[PDB]
Amino acid sequence: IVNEKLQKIIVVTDGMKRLYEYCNCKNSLETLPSAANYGSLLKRLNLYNLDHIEMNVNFYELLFPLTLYNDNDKTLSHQLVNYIFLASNYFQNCAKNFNYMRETFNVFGPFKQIDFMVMFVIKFNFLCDMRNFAKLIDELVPNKQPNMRIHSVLVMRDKIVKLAFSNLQFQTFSKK
C-alpha cells in the first residue's frame, strides 16, 4: 500500500469533520490558529474527550501522499515544495507559541482539555489547508513509481518539525 494513504486521509478527515460537526475549511491560515476562528470548534470538541491527541504530526509521512500526484506536464514540482516550507514554518510558529495559543483558546471559555484543544485545532487547520491544496491538485493523478528528490527536502523539514514538537513537549512536561 503506497497510494491508499491519500484517499484514506481524505476519508478520515471527512469522518472526523462529521464526528465533531465542524468542517470550517474556509478559514485558510498561514500565521497562527486563533479562537477568533475556532471558538465554536472548541465548544464542539468539549463534547467529546480528546484523549487521542498526539504531540507531533509525523510531517514527512503526513505529507508524503501528496507526492503521488502525476506532474508530468511544472506546477506541482514547485507548489508542493512551497507547501512543504509553509507547513514547516506554520508548525514552527505553532510549537514556538503553543503556550500563547493555549492561553488564548482557554481565555475563550477555559477547557479542562485546553492542550488537547489547541493541538486539535492546529491539526484541523492544517488538515483544512491540506485538503484545499489537494482539491487544487485533484486534477493530477496520484500513483506510485515515485522519483522526486524533493522528498529529501520533505525529510529535512520533517526533522525540523519533529525537533520543534520535541522542544514543545519538553516544555509542557518539565513545567509540571
Partner: protein
Amino acid sequence: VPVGMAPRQMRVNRCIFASIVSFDACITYKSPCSPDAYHDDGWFICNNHLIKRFKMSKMVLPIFDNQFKMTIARHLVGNKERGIKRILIPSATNYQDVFNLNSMMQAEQLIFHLIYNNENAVNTICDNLKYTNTQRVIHSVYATTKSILDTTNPNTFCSRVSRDELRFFDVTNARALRGGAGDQLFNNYSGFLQNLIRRAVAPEYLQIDTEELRFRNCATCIIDETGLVASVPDGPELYNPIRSSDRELDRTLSGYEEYPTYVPLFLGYQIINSE
C-alpha cells in the same frame, strides 16, 4: 635591442562583457571592465557590467567559528523607481524591452541575445556580420559567450556548477496563495542567468542537515515573469540612497562600526546536507 623569450601565460577576464569589442578593425575600442573580472570566483560578470546593466553590485556575506564566506549582491534601485525600473534582472520575455539594444554595440546585443537564447536574433546578427574580419569578430565574440554559457549551464555535467544543493528561492511569501513559479521560470532561465541569480541573491535561511540559520526575516527581492524584481514583497519600498556610479552630529558620532545603508538581496532557503 629587442628582447623576447617565449609565449607567456597571464590572467583571464571572466566577465562575459569583456568580450565586447567594436566590430571595427579600423576603430579601436576597449570595454570598461572592473579588475574583479580576474578573480576565479563564480561571478562571470565584472562589477562594472553588473552595475551598468543589472543595477547590482557585488558583496560578500561572511557567515560564521565555522566561517564559510559566501557571495551576495545588493540593490541599486532607487526608492522612487517603479515598474520596469524595478526589474532588477529581466527575463527572456522582456530583456529586449528593458535593454535598449538599438542604442548599444551590436556585439553587446548579440551577447544579450545569447544570454536570453533568442537564437533567431543570434543567427540574424551572424548572417549580417558574415555578409559584409567581421567573421573573425563573430568567431571571437560568439565563442567566448558560448563558452561561458556552457560553463555555467547548470543543467548539465562536466561544468562544475551543480553542487546537488536544493535552494528554493521560490519559497512562498507565507501570505501569497498557492503560487511561486519563480523556480519554474528559473528552470527556464539561461545557465548564466541562473548562476548569476544564485550568486547575487543570498538565501533568507540556510538549511544544513538539521540546522536552519536565519539571516533575513523578510525577503528583499522577488522573482516573477519579468525576472528579478527589486521590490519589497509587502509593499512600501525600502529607501535606497544611490550615491555614485550610474554634520556636527556626525562629527560628534565617531566611528561605531556604522551599519551599511545598502539593501542586500535576500530570498529563499538554501538546502545542503550530508546525504
